[PDB]
Design a protein around this ligand. Sequence first.
Ligand SMILES: Cc1[nH]c(-c2csc(N=C(N)N)n2)c2c1C(=O)CC(C)(C)C2
Length: 113
Amino acid sequence: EMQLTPFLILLRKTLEQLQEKDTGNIFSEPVPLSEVPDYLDHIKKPMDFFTMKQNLEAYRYLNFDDFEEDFNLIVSNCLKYNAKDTIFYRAAVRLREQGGAVLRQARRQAEKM
Ligand SMILES: Cc1[nH]c(-c2csc(N=C(N)N)n2)c2c1C(=O)CC(C)(C)C2
């Protein structure tokens, strides 16, 4: 219920802030299915920040919830696949915490559009 171009500006900036939290660059490109062959036996919808960028620029996020849903998939897929005592699981918890705060801030800025 606002103009497209500003909303997308906000989502691009939000996506950059989320990517900045992935300091190890483990969430920034699809999981390499060539290196992890059992990945899709548990993960129904892989997600990553590059795919989110592509979706954003294809006009596939037209509300904040659709954007936040794909972010949440990045986190939940990693929590699902990895044991708790791993760097990967711990990284997803960190991203959930740090990324959640980025998202709330961005949602506020959207309410004003
Ligand atoms: C979020 C995430 N990112 C990656 C990744 C990026 S790059 C790369 N290269 C490799 N040779 N494994 N793995 C992984 C992951 C997991 O959840 C666990 C995992 C074993 C599927 C591996």
